[PDB]
């Protein structure tokens, strides 16, 4: 199914910073918050 009206990232996700052409600059995983 999957959402497509709401993107609620309230659970682990992967994020990728990239150049529009397609070169990947950074890749990360968000598992939980840090500090406060």
């Amino acid at each position: 199914s999957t959402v497509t009206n709401e993107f609620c990232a309230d659970h682990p996700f992967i994020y990728v910073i990239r150049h529009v052409d397609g070169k990947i600059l950074f890749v990360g995983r968000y598992c939980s918050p840090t500090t406060n």
């Binding site: 497509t4 709401e6 309230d10 992967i14 600059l25 950074f26 890749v27 990360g28 995983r29 968000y30």
Partner: protein, 297 residues
């Protein structure tokens, strides 16, 4: 992302953030000085106003280098005395100002006199969102660390704008993928499992090939976005991960770098430090990578 997967798989439960080009650019330095098997293993990794990178190579002054190695490295070479500790401070200060204070200090231990060469890479990124999140909408929401473990996070919200997006169905998990653009030509693509706990199997299939297929399929759609405002710094020893990936003739004794130095040198460490700040106004990130080559006397 080959390296990302390794590091991620070996730190289950932990936030992870790395800069593949930074790592790749140090491995390439090493490539330039490697011969044979070491060279073959490393070759598999030889590869704007928002993204800047720089490589520096520091050589032990009393060492004698191969011109080829130096030809391939260019004006990024410099001779120094690893003995004097001001040396570590000068290197850090340099990485520190280039990363706008985000990677400081890159080097944590007074280098060893056993050291022959330091190949360092640093990268920096900062860009405003094409469309800023309004602080007015930022508020605390529960974040699911696990299905029944809830933790408070400051969540950013952006309503009723349109973004490139795709609902992806895959044998390894279904997920939503969105692209959040930055002023300029870069963007942040976010992959959200439909299952509160489904990141791992998708992570396990995060491939350059797959990732592009997913991006190719995205279309503009209206969708409301809620994402955490966050800051993270990471520090990783990449050796184990890289060995597990097939770089078994690269670190330690078995390292062959006779196309770099005369003597017998070995690469005994490779650190990657990173930083990222995602807020309603912009995203700021940095990373620096260092491989330390020793064994010469």
């Amino acid at each position: 992302m080959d390296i990302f997967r390794e590091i991620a798989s070996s730190m289950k439960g932990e936030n992870v953030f790395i800069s593949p080009p930074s790592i790749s650019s140090v491995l390439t330095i090493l490539y330039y000085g490697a011969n044979g098997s070491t060279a073959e293993q490393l070759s598999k990794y030889v590869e704007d106003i928002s993204f800047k990178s720089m490589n520096k190579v520091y050589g032990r002054y009393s060492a004698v280098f191969k011109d080829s190695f130096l030809r391939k490295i260019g004006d990024n070479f410099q001779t120094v005395d690893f003995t004097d500790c001001r040396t570590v401070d000068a290197i850090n200060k340099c990485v520190d100002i280039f990363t706008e204070g985000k990677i400081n200090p890159l080097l944590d231990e007074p280098l060893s006199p056993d050291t022959c060469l330091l190949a360092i890479s640093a990268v920096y990124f900062k860009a405003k969102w094409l469309m800023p999140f309004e602080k007015e909408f930022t508020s605390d929401y529960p974040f699911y660390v696990s299905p029944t473990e809830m933790v408070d996070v400051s969540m950013m919200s952006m309503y009723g704008e349109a973004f490139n997006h795709a609902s992806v169905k895959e044998s390894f998990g279904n997920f939503s993928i969105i692209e959040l653009p930055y002023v300029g030509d870069t963007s942040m693509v976010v992959i959200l499992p439909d299952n509160i706990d489904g990141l791992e199997s998708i992570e396990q299939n995060l491939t350059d090939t797959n990732f592009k297929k997913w991006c190719d399929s995205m279309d503009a759609m209206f969708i409301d976005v809620h994402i955490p405002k966050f800051k993270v710094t990471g520090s990783y020893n990449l050796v184990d991960a890289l060995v597990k990936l097939g770089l078994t003739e690269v670190f330690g004794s078995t390292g062959d770098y006779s196309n770099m130095c005369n003597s017998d040198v070995s690469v005994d460490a490779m650190i990657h430090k990173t930083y990222i700040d995602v807020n309603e106004e912009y995203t700021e990130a940095a990373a620096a990578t260092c491989a330390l080559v020793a064994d010469c006397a």
